[PDB]
RNA sequence: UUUUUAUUAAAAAAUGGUAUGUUUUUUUU
């Protein structure tokens, strides 16, 4: 939700830990932190 | 335009651009929430 | 719902959401000189090839002089005597490197 | 190293609180 815009319901509630695993993919161990990924990026380039 | 089709009297919103744009700054909380809720209704109308 | 902060929807909780900023967050030389010696001997070799080019120019001058004498192709001035003067220059540069080592 | 912004709601009926069931004809010969 962009802080000036509307807020809705999730439309996708399937985020339970059914996999029960972190997949060793998004872990801090192997990621370079330079700048936080704000939601403006996730809305501007949704597929990346 | 200079040419049109004579929409109905209730099909002219006259203030839609007020909340389609951003909210003016330094407004009380209720006015900001009103802007947001009207924008939410418009977005929900446009989505379906 | 924004930068990872907030709950998905205010419905179901006793609150209205409305996250606020913390407002109290604390935002805080070279050891093996043999390389230089090898470079020095290599620049000596470059000077050697430079003087060989000069010798070739002298050979062209000799060819022109011989052609002028004939009037009154390409030839070589010195086939091997240049190697003796080259050995003389070798002696000269060896004396130079000895003097440089003595100076240090 | 300088600044922020984010604001769910909301009232009416029946359950639920003076049950309910009864109750007056014009001819005989």
Curated annotation (Swiss-Prot), chain B:
It is found in: Nucleus. It comes from the Eukaryota. Belongs to the 40S cdc5-associated complex (or cwf complex), a spliceosome sub-complex reminiscent of a late-stage spliceosome composed of the U2, U5 and U6 snRNAs and at least brr2, cdc5, cwf2/prp3, cwf3/syf1, cwf4/syf3, cwf5/ecm2, spp42/cwf6, cwf7/spf27, cwf8, cwf9, cwf10, cwf11, cwf12, prp45/cwf13, cwf14, cwf15, cwf16, cwf17, cwf18, cwf19, cwf20, cwf21, cwf22, cwf23, cwf24, cwf25, cwf26, cyp7/cwf27, cwf28, cwf29/ist3, lea1, msl1, prp5/cwf1, prp10, prp12/sap130, prp17, prp22, sap61, sap62, sap114, sap145, slu7, smb1, smd1, smd3, smf1, smg1 and syf2. Interacts with prp1. Involved in pre-mRNA splicing. May be involved in endoplasmic reticulum-associated protein degradation (ERAD) and required for growth at low and high temperatures. Required for pre-spliceosome formation, which is the first step of pre-mRNA splicing. This protein is associated with snRNP U5. Has a role in branch site-3' splice site selection. Associates with the branch site-3' splice 3'-exon region. This is Pre-mRNA-splicing factor spp42. The gene is spp42.
Swiss-Prot record, chain C:
Belongs to the CWC21 family. Belongs to the 40S cdc5-associated complex (or cwf complex), a spliceosome sub-complex reminiscent of a late-stage spliceosome composed of the U2, U5 and U6 snRNAs and at least brr2, cdc5, cwf2/prp3, cwf3/syf1, cwf4/syf3, cwf5/ecm2, spp42/cwf6, cwf7/spf27, cwf8, cwf9, cwf10, cwf11, cwf12, prp45/cwf13, cwf14, cwf15, cwf16, cwf17, cwf18, cwf19, cwf20, cwf21, cwf22, cwf23, cwf24, cwf25, cwf26, cyp7/cwf27, cwf28, cwf29/ist3, lea1, msl1, prp5/cwf1, prp10, prp12/sap130, prp17, prp22, sap61, sap62, sap114, sap145, slu7, smb1, smd1, smd3, smf1, smg1 and syf2. Residues 60-72 have a biased composition (Polar residues). Coiled coil: none annotated. The lineage of its organism: Eukaryota, Fungi, Dikarya, Ascomycota, Taphrinomycotina. Residues 35-72 form the CWF21 domain. The modification Phosphoserine is found at residue 77. This is Pre-mRNA-splicing factor cwf21.
